[PDB]
Structure 1
Amino acid sequence: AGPEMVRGQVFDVGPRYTNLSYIGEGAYGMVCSAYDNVNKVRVAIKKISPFEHQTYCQRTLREIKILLRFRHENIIGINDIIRAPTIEQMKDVYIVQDLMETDLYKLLKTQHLSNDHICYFLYQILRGLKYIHSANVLHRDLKPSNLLLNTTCDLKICDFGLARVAATRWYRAPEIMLNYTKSIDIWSVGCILAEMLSNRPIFPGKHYLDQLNHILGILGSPSQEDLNCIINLKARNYLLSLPHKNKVPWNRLFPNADSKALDLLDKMLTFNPHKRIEVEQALAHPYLEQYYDPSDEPIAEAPFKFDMELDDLPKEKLKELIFEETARFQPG
């Protein structure tokens, strides 16, 4: 028969993984659903081709090392890894993960969420983020397409490509554009909460400049303290040259939303990251009272730390480290 192919891209994952079907894609790869003849279940296989670029090699090694170390109910894990038996032949890496029914991007495209469903989804994102942040790791790309869901509404965070030890424009914090920290992930969670409440993105900017205008159009003009930071000159002089913009109240933008949901949203969507609410205070907020449970909210045993500076290593050395990291999944 030979190896299977999906939309041009070859998928040399057999004979264990057969009956392949397209489910998603990325900047340097493809995601496919496949049947596992060992566990007798369908799984998700993430193919990635990162060896042509040094940045992609860093992301691949960071993603593999983080997900293998991490073990949480609201975070996607790695079940198996397939790659060529020799380093010279390795051009692709296949990460086998648990298959989920849908994601929040697909769900908000077709379904209207009840307050209890918005409350339960937000809790699981923050429960998962509590574990990521306890390990001193930043996701840096939290969005509805990276939040996977199953039949029984169980949520899982995926795509740890941009993850780092302490992105999509619409869920990007103003400090990334103005000038990184745990607070940039909370901003993204705020953007996700607002999208669950209206089935529309709160800041759908077409470019980095239009993105800042959409934020100022709701939050109002920034104060002297909000601008008093290590901000870039171009962005600082641009925001100062703009006319005065009034703050739109949260109850006016979301008329029939829960008052507690809007109080937490305000604390998550705060321009100043220092004044922005943290993952623990967000979980203890009265909006997530019926789900908050410090007893069943695990944290990472120790903070994450890389043994070597990956930014200084060339793509040739990073390829060797990727080959060595994926070796324990090879037969023998």
Structure 2
Amino acid sequence: GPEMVRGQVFDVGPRYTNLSYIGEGAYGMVCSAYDNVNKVRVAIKKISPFEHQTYCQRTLREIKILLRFRHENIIGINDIIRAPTIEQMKDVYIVQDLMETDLYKLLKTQHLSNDHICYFLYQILRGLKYIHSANVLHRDLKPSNLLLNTTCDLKICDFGLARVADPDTRWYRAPEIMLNKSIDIWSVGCILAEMLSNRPIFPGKHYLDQLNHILGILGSPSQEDLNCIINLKARNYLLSLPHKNKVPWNRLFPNADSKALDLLDKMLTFNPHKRIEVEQALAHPYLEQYYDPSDEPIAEAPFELDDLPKEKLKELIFEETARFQP
């Protein structure tokens, strides 16, 4: 009865037909499909998380957040398919917009132009404005989580790690998280850097090597950065560390644009309190030809702690997808 992709039941018909393998990952499998009802191309992805709570946790964030968000530079959810009773729900099928590819695949095939880089960056920070304006952190910004259509339109995906802000992949992890909302800007910076060099800038093997890469290019932190840390054991680590001189951006990036390296700097500042916020990164000279606060929306309804048994999450998951059932 049901369609099937690489020996994987896709029980999404009769509405969704002509299914085609796009990719896979720990999450599940993603597919291109035809919506026979709205007569348009979509992406369906089959998730099977009900065994372990952290899967249930990521499933529910993904759904909660994306249903609640509407933005031009954020992948929405269109429809969601799941069994009509909670006992029999083993899988969720989340239908979203179809796109051509992600930034990860794009970088592996082409060195981009300052034209491609200025626009992509503009759209990222645009997306991020909405997200932060909802008091919400993505927490996992990176190339493979920025989707592209043939029109060079960029959309941000995967809110599996999303949280509400509340001060109480490694290569894009901000330095404060190896020690103890700006954490997104550091990712956006590391992404800017990769788009410049077609190389990940800070490719650490482990959490300590990650720092060494970071301090390798920034040099050792200043007095006031060290202060604004308040972790002692962490800070004690940093002190124990041989002095390393700041690399000027333009020696790592010779053929790169003067204005962008000025934005990268304010983006990759060690001190989280000093680092540029989205609002301003937008207002930076490098994005002068794009920056338009009229055309740069903010969440109308800003936002939720769920460390619960996988049975209550399965309930909430069922509850949140209810709106798609007769």
TM-score range, shorter chain: over 0.9
Quote how far apart the aligned CAs of 1:271 are: 0.6
Taking the aligned partners of 2:127 and 2:42, their CA distance within structure 1 comes to 21
Quote how far apart the aligned CAs of 1:153 are: 0.3
- Where 2:126 maps in the other structure, the secondary structure is helix
Quote how far apart the aligned CAs of 1:28 are: 3.2
* Kept in 1: contact 2:229–2:235 (CA 8 A): no
* Kept in 2: contact 1:108–1:196 (CA 8 A): yes
Corresponding position of 1:67: 66
Corresponding position of 1:86: 85
Corresponding position of 1:241: 240
Report which stretch shifted further, 144-153 or 21-30: 21-30
Quote how far apart the aligned CAs of 1:26 are: 3.4
Report which stretch shifted further, 33-42 or 142-151: 33-42
- Where 1:326 maps in the other structure, the secondary structure is helix
Report which stretch shifted further, 272-281 or 220-229: 220-229
* Kept in 1: contact 2:130–2:299 (CA 8 A): yes
TM-score (norm 2): 0.95
Quote how far apart the aligned CAs of 1:36 are: 1.8
Relative to 1, partners in 2 of residues 1:46 and 1:231: Cα closer, same or farther, differing over 3 Å? Answer: farther
* Kept in 1: contact 2:228–2:271 (CA 8 A): no
Cα deviation digits, residues 181-217 of structure 1 (max 9, x gap): x100000000111111111110111111111110011
- Where 1:178 maps in the other structure, the secondary structure is coil
Quote how far apart the aligned CAs of 1:45 are: 1.1
Report which stretch shifted further, 243-252 or 221-230: 221-230
Quote how far apart the aligned CAs of 1:33 are: 1.5
Quote how far apart the aligned CAs of 1:8 are: 3.5
Taking the aligned partners of 2:122 and 2:112, their CA distance within structure 1 comes to 15
* Kept in 1: contact 2:49–2:59 (CA 8 A): yes
Quote how far apart the aligned CAs of 1:96 are: 0.2
Which residue of 311, 316, 321 maps to 1:316? 311
Provide the aligned length of Structure 1 versus Structure 2.
323
Quote how far apart the aligned CAs of 1:10 are: 2.1
Quote how far apart the aligned CAs of 1:235 are: 4.1
* Kept in 2: contact 1:264–1:282 (CA 8 A): yes
TM-score (norm 1): 0.93
Quote how far apart the aligned CAs of 1:234 are: 5.5
* Kept in 2: contact 1:178–1:231 (CA 8 A): no
What percentage of residue pairs aligned between the two structures are identical? 100
Report which stretch shifted further, 235-244 or 290-299: 235-244
1:24-43 residue pairs with structure 2 within 5 A? Answer: 24-43=23-42
Taking the aligned partners of 1:134 and 1:65, their CA distance within structure 2 comes to 16
* Kept in 2: contact 1:139–1:160 (CA 8 A): yes
Report which stretch shifted further, 207-216 or 51-60: 51-60
Taking the aligned partners of 1:29 and 1:227, their CA distance within structure 2 comes to 42
Q: Does 1:120 align with 2:115?
A: no
* Kept in 2: contact 1:103–1:148 (CA 8 A): yes
Quote how far apart the aligned CAs of 1:228 are: 2.4
* Kept in 2: contact 1:310–1:318 (CA 8 A): no
Gaps of 5+ in 2: none
Taking the aligned partners of 1:178 and 1:310, their CA distance within structure 2 comes to 23
Quote how far apart the aligned CAs of 1:312 are: 4.2
Superposition RMSD on alpha carbons, in Å?
Answer: 1.6
- Where 2:265 maps in the other structure, the secondary structure is helix
* Kept in 2: contact 1:47–1:94 (CA 8 A): yes
- Where 2:178 maps in the other structure, the secondary structure is helix
Quote how far apart the aligned CAs of 1:237 are: 3.6
Cα deviation digits, residues 116-142 of structure 1 (max 9, x gap): 110000000001100000010100000
Relative to 1, partners in 2 of residues 1:157 and 1:312: Cα closer, same or farther, differing over 3 Å? Answer: closer
Quote how far apart the aligned CAs of 1:150 are: 0.5
* Kept in 2: contact 1:30–1:48 (CA 8 A): yes
Cα deviation digits, residues 94-133 of structure 1 (max 9, x gap): 1100000111111111112111110000000001100000
1:175-194 residue pairs with structure 2 within 5 A? Answer: 175-179=176-180, 182-194=181-193
Relative to 1, partners in 2 of residues 1:172 and 1:231: Cα closer, same or farther, differing over 3 Å? Answer: farther
Quote how far apart the aligned CAs of 1:15 are: 1.7
* Kept in 1: contact 2:164–2:304 (CA 8 A): no
Quote how far apart the aligned CAs of 1:310 are: 4.3
Quote how far apart the aligned CAs of 1:229 are: 4.1
Taking the aligned partners of 2:42 and 2:35, their CA distance within structure 1 comes to 7
Report which stretch shifted further, 274-283 or 43-52: 43-52
Taking the aligned partners of 1:231 and 1:10, their CA distance within structure 2 comes to 51
Taking the aligned partners of 2:313 and 2:91, their CA distance within structure 1 comes to 14
Report which stretch shifted further, 202-211 or 27-36: 27-36
Query: Deviation above 3 Å: which 4+ runs of structure 1?
Result: 229-238
